[model samples]
Target: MIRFEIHGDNLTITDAIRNYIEEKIGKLERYFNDVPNAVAHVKVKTYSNSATKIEVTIPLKNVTLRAEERNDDLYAGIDLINNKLERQVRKYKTRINRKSRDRGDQEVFV
Candidate 1:
């Protein structure tokens, strides 16, 4: 699975927020079989004029996934990164698996 460390700059990370983060980003585990010892660093930063920016990165055994998004809403930023990460992970994994299709019927991540 994944162990995520979330850091907030000049903001309070409430339980609801934490749950939202986990729920959104946790889907990454589905793309792996022997999951890596992955440490995900998630940062939520607030700008002077109330803009929220988010950066998240995870260095896995075979891939490094990261994304950044900024908006007036933190939740939106979270969602944006979640989608971006999903796309990145899926695309990279798909390409790698395609090059090794000779392992017939085997799981791509295995």
Candidate 2:
């Protein structure tokens, strides 16, 4: 199962926000067979000029997925970072699947 740990500098993480993040990000595990006990580190920081920064890091067995976004709205930054992380997971899964297919014993039909 995937685990999440969130941190914020100048903002509070509400239950609703946590639930939303977990529900959205947890869908990424469907592409893998052995989903590791991954930890998602989410951090939110705000600048004096009203710009918010959202950073997320997911460290897997072999690689680390990280994304950072700065926006006027914290929610928007969170959404953008979530999308970036999802794309990274998809790309990594695709690469591994391609390698496995190429190295498999079965012959190609197409």
Candidate 3:
């Protein structure tokens, strides 16, 4: 499915945090077959104040899915970005399947 690279700025990323993201992504994976050898780039950044910002980008064979979100509570921001990324993925699933079919390569989505 998605391999998370959860990096941070001005904040420590804990295993608890790691688990949160992995669980979220794994939850999303139940909907469709994952991309072939997919690697999702995930990043977390913190502001001097309480705000946190996160971005997730998933690169495809010829497409890119991404989302950016911010919130005062880091977990809230994470949860927000979580939805953004998953919806993007699920929404694009059919497109990915169609494209691969047209290309005559059943090597993409579910």
Clashing pairs in 3: none
lDDT of 2 by residue, 1-110 (tens): 67777786645557876887677657665445587776678787875447778787766543466667777776677666556556766677666768766765355655
Off by more than 4 A, model 1: 30-33, 47-50, 101-110
Number of clashing residue pairs, candidate 3: 0
TM-score of each: 0.69, 0.68, 0.61
Better of 1 and 3 by TM-score: 1
Q: By descending TM-score, how would the candidates be arranged?
A: 1, 2, 3
Question: Which structure among the candidates has the greatest TM-score?
Answer: 1
Each candidate's clash count: 0, 0, 0
How much lDDT does each candidate structure score? 0.67, 0.67, 0.62
Q: lDDT for model 2, please.
A: 0.67
Give the TM-score (vs. native) of candidate 3. 0.61
Residue 63's lDDT within candidate 1 is 67
Clash pairs (backbone) in predicted model 2: none
Model 3 error, position 104 (Å) = 21
Model 2, position 42, has a per-residue lDDT of: 78
In the range 25-45, model 3's lDDT, one tens digit per residue, is: 666554446455454576768
Model 2 TM-score is: 0.68
